[PDB]
Amino acid sequence: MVSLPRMVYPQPKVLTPCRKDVLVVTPWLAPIVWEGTFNIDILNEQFRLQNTTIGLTVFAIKKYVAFLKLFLETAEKHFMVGHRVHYYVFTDQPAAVPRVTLGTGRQLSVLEVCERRFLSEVDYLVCVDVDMEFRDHVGVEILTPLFGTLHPGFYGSSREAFTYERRPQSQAYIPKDEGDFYYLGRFFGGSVQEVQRLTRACHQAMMVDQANGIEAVWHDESHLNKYLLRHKPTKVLSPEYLWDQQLLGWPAVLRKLRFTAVP
Ligand SMILES: [Hg+2]
Ligand SMILES: [Hg+2]
Ligand SMILES: [Hg+2]
Ligand SMILES: [Hg+2]
Numbered sequence: 462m463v464s465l466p467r468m469v470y471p472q473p474k475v476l477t478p479c480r481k482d483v484l485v486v487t488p489w490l491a492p493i494v495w496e497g498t499f500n501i502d503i504l505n506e507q508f509r510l511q512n513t514t515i516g517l518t519v520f521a522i523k524k525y526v527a528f529l530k531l532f533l534e535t536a537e538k539h540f541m542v543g544h545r546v547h548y549y550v551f552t553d554q555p556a557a558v559p560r561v562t563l564g565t566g567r568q569l570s571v572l573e574v575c576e577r578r579f580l581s582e583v584d585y586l587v588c589v590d591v592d593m594e595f596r597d598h599v600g601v602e603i604l605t606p607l608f609g610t611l612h613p614g615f616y617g618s619s620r621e622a623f624t625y626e627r628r629p630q631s632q633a634y635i636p637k638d639e640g641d642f643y644y645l646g647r648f649f650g651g652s653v654q655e656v657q658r659l660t661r662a663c664h665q666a667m668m669v670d671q672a673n674g675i676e677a678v679w680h681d682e683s684h685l686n687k688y689l690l691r692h693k694p695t696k697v698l699s700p701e702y703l704w705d706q707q708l709l710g711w712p713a714v715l716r717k718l719r720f721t722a723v724p
Pocket of ligand 2: 662663664666684685687688
């Protein structure tokens, strides 16, 4: 709500689309974040004036603790740089967490494996996997009440091809004539309130499923897709935000590869 300062930047072009090769807004008017759609300077100003704090959560159990060093090092270089960040590392090996040097205004909490905590420590929560690395900018352009990320393997696929759970006996069930996009179960976020709302719904749906002796085809991801179908995300991130260059290369439609799996 605080007034932005004078800023000098190119005037928006009303009669000139900001990307003519991709959809930049959903049918429910949520922006789809692609490179070229946002001016990061304006967005940085808006969020900094609000002294925004972003929590990044990851689970690293067993052999996965080995991915923490690169994950954290690259996050330090590309994730919410300039803003307050609180990393939450849930692990079964507290002593094995790498000693990574953090920039000012950034902290890390190791939780050995308390939800009200998030409500008082951060404004937004971003949930990802540890076996990844940031390769380019991932900033406040993604922040919104609730966001989902387009799966790199299905962004150009028809809904019939989406690997949603197709069995009516499952709570994650989505018929062939339904569905907007196929979202990643491993990269989502939003306000603490909305994220806890999504995880609480997923947890309940998965319990009902097991009680009925059924397990969704893609587990958590299947339920996340059911949730986002029925509760439209306020922002959708393009595949730039979770790519796999080994399996998909570098298409012209992707101007940047920001976050990827480690081969
Ligand atoms: Hg989370
Ligand atoms: Hg769900
Ligand atoms: Hg779940
Ligand atoms: Hg979920």
